[PDB]
């Protein structure tokens, strides 16, 4: 529930470093693909488990 982004998925580190003002990312299907950790700024991908 990062800053109100409710969902379910597996979090994993990635090299997709966002911009300093950007918070989360989306794909061509308007689905959230990655989000940053508001405690320690790191990009974590959001993918369905199985």
């Amino acid at each position: 529930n990062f800053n109100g982004l409710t969902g379910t998925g597996v979090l994993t580190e990635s090299n997709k470093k966002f911009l300093p003002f950007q918070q989360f990312g989306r794909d061509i299907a308007d689905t959230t693909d990655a989000v940053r950790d508001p405690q320690t700024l790191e990009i974590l991908d959001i993918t369905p488990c199985s």
Binding site: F21, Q22, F24, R26
Partner: peptide, 26 residues
């Protein structure tokens, strides 16, 4: 002292593709 004010207008000086900002933090 507040008595001075100068300005000029022409309704156009340039017209290019600028002023595009990030609409969201996505």
């Amino acid at each position: 002292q507040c008595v001075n004010l100068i300005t000029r207008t022409q309704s156009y000086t340039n017209s290019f593709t600028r002023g595009v900002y990030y609409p969201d933090k996505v």
